[PDB]
Design a protein around this ligand. Structure first.
Ligand SMILES: O=C(O)c1ccc(-c2ccccc2[N+](=O)[O-])o1
Ligand SMILES: [Mn+2]
Ligand SMILES: [Mn+2]
Ligand code: NA
Length: 262
C-alpha cells in the first residue's frame, strides 16, 4: 500500500538518496576506456560498505549477483558486471545504484559517455535525461501519474525514439520496490493521484530503435530486440506540498534539487 513518509522517514530518505548519488559521483573518474564493468562494481561496493557504511540493495535481490547494474550500449538494463567486459571509446554506459542506509533506500542511475562521444549516443542520453527532467517538473499534489507517463512518451517518441514498456519507476522507502508503479508511457490502467509525502522513482528506459527487448540466457541481461542503443536515467524523489524534492541530485545534474510550483 502506498504510504506517506513522515518527516523523520523523509530525512532518512534524504540521507540514503544522497549516498546513492555520491556513488555515481565517485565512480565518474573510473569510467574510462579499458576498465572492466567488473572492477567498477567492486569499486562501488567497497565505497558503499567501507566509506558510506551502507549496503547495496541489489546484491542478492531476486538473486542478482552483483552490487550495481552496469549496462552498455544495446543492453537495456540489468547488465551484470563482468571482469572480462571492457568499456571502449564511443560507448554509452548506465550505472544503476541502490543503497540502503538506516533502513531506507536511495535509488538512482545515470549515463556516462566513454571516450570520444558519438553524436547519436550523446543525443539519446541527453533526450533520455530530458524526458526524466520534464517528468520531474510535472510532479506535484493533484496530478495523476498517467499524465506524467503520457508526457514522457510523447516527448521521447517525438524524437523518433521509443519507451521500454516492461519496466517502470516505483514507490520506495523501507522497501526497494513499493507501490505505486510509475509507468513511463500512457496506460489506460494508470490512475494514481500524487499526494505530499509520497516517495518514488522515475527511470525511463529509452531505445533509439524499436521498443521490443530480449533477455539473454544468463537470466538477467536485457538487450534491445533490434540491438539499437538504449539509455536510462533515474532519480528518487519526495512529493512536497507544491512540487517535489529530488533526493538523489548530483553536481552534474542541470535541474534544481527543489522544484517549486507555488
Ligand atoms: O532501478 C531499479 O528499480 C532496479 C534496478 C535493478 C533492479 C532489479 C529489479 C529486479 C531484480 C533485480 C534488480 N537488481 O537491481 O538486481 O531494480
Ligand atoms: Mn535503479
Ligand atoms: Mn528504480
Ligand atoms: Na544501454
Amino acid at each position: 500500500a502506498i504510504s506517506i513518509k513522515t518527516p523523520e522517514d523523509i530525512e532518512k530518505m534524504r540521507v540514503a538518496g544522497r549516498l546513492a548519488a555520491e556513488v555515481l559521483e565517485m565512480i565518474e573518474p573510473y569510467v574510462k576506456p579499458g576498465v572492466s564493468t567488473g572492477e567498477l562494481d567492486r569499486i562501488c561496493n567497497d565505497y558503499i560498505v567501507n566509506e558510506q557504511h551502507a549496503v547495496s540493495a541489489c546484491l542478492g535481490y531476486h538473486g542478482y549477483p552483483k552490487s550495481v547494474c552496469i549496462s552498455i550500449n544495446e543492453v537495456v538494463c540489468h547488465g551484470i558486471p563482468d571482469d572480462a567486459k571492457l568499456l571502449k571509446d564511443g560507448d554509452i554506459v548506465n550505472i544503476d545504484v541502490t543503497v540502503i542506509k538506516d533502513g531506507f533506500h536511495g535509488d538512482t542511475s545515470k549515463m556516462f559517455i566513454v571516450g570520444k562521444p558519438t553524436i547519436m549516443g550523446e543525443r539519446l542520453c541527453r533526450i533520455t535525461q530530458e524526458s526524466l527532467y520534464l517528468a520531474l517538473r510535472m510532479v506535484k499534489p493533484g496530478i495523476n501519474l498517467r499524465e506524467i507517463g503520457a508526457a514522457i512518451q510523447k516527448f521521447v517518441e517525438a524524437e523518433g525514439f521509443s519507451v521500454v514498456r516492461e519496466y517502470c519507476g516505483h514507490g520506495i522507502g523501507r522497501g526497494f520496490h513499493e507501490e505505486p508503479q510509475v509507468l513511463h508511457y500512457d496506460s489506460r490502467e494508470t490512475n494514481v493521484v500524487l499526494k505530499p509525502g509520497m516517495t518514488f522513482t522515475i527511470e525511463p528506459m529509452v531505445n533509439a530503435g524499436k521498443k521490443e527487448i530480449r533477455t539473454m540466457k544468463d537470466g538477467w541481461t536485457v538487450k534491445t530486440k533490434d540491438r539499437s542503443l538504449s539509455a536510462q536515467y533515474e532519480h528518487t524523489i519526495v512529493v512536497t506540498d507544491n512540487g517535489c524534492e529530488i533526493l538523489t541530485l548530483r553536481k552534474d545534474d542541470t535541474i534544481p534539487a527543489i522544484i517549486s510550483h507555488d
